Amino acid sequence: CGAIASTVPNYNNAKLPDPFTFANGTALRTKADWSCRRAEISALIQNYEAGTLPPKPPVVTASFSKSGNTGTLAITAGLSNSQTIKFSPTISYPSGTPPANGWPLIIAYEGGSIPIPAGVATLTYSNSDMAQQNSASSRGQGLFYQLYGSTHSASAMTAWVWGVSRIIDALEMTPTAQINTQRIGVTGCSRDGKGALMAGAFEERIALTIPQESGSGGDACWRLSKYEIDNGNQVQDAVEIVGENVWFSTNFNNYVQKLPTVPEDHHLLAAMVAPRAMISFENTDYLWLSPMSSFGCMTAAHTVWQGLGIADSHGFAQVGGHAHCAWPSSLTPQLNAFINRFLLDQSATTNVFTTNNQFGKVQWNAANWITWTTPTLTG
Ligand SMILES: *[C@@H]1O[C@H](CO)[C@@H](O)[C@H](O)[C@H]1NC(C)=O
Ligand SMILES: *[C@H]1O[C@H](CO)[C@@H](O)[C@H](O)[C@@H]1O
Ligand SMILES: *[C@H]1O[C@H](CO)[C@@H](O)[C@H](O)[C@@H]1O
């Protein structure tokens, strides 16, 4: 891919950054080009809003034990300077004999808030232990920072991603966990839905990503939410979110008032999942979630899957009429379709892209935000 850009000093675009053009002005043309564009997007997101995602450390070990239907995966991670941390997620297993290749698994941030089908194991990930997230007071606290240092630039969500990567490393080394590491999904609701999106985007071994009501800093776009808040919708936005918690790097503070200068938005974050599968779910009852911004953000991200000829690997379903993080039974068929196809190997059709258009004081106008023509990427 060559030397990937992590900063674009002269960038200034009030509309959504174009997925299909590299920072240097080179247009994407092949499906393989998307791998390099994803890597550039990774670098840009880390530089502007997420902080640094460390690579696998040189020590990662794991032991496993099981009591009844609950496994405990005891992980240790260590740096070359001997510093180490440990954490022990648990796994809830279906009973009986697993498939020949092991159970498909969903890594659920603090248990998630989706119903998980019977043939799928659930790993409960205590992401708040990995990086605290009470308020701005939490900056640099959590197991991640006991390894890398409390001034490490990673946001809380980037630290969470790191923990997921170590979990998957551990599973690959632990046959007795009886997990099919080729069929791992990730989910989370609300602030943990923001986290699940980051995990699926940055950790390519995740086969299915399921963010639930993730809102601002999740599947909503910064630029669209600024439009909402300026027009009287009481949405969460970039300016408020960096003061509320530590889900983003301290450096993001330098850009929340200057969003057009940021050469990325969360449509590119979501597009990092491609060519893997993702369906996110949103709720128009809570303007805090920035409903129009999520629909426009994911509509923009969808063009990447469309350009790759795999539109049905990316879903979006947005409805109203239920409490925050309550699962409406009306969406269970859509959720199960993605789980069935991408984790359970069924021939389920996954064409899901729906909203009720309940956006409050604004509307979605694609011509005001998307300026690119989706190319047909070759090869
Ligand atoms: C532009 O940047 C991309 C990503 O680093 C790279 O693959 C491509 O070769 C660059 N274009 C030129 C002409 O070097
Ligand atoms: C982001 O990272 C790139 C390398 O990918 C640097 O060149 C840049 O200065 C910034 O540190
Ligand atoms: C990209 O990022 C660098 C810092 O890494 C800035 O100096 C530059 O102006 C652009 O924001």
Numbering used by the authors: 81 to 459
Question: What do the paper's sentences say?
Answer:
Crystals obtained from dWT turned out to contain the apo form of the catalytic domain, resulting from cleavage of the wild-type enzyme (Δ*dWT). This shows that the deglycosylated, unprotected linker region is susceptible to proteolytic cleavage. The structure of Δ*dWT was determined to 1.96 Å resolution. Notably, the cleaved variant Δ*dWT was spontaneously produced in crystallization experiments with dWT. c Relative stability of the CuGE variants. All crystals of the catalytic domain of CuGE belong to the tetragonal space group P41212 with two molecules in the asymmetric unit. In all CuGE structures, a single N-acetyl glucosamine moiety is attached to N104 as a relic of the N-glycosylation. In addition, signs of O-glycosylation (α-1-linked mannose) are observed in some of the structures.
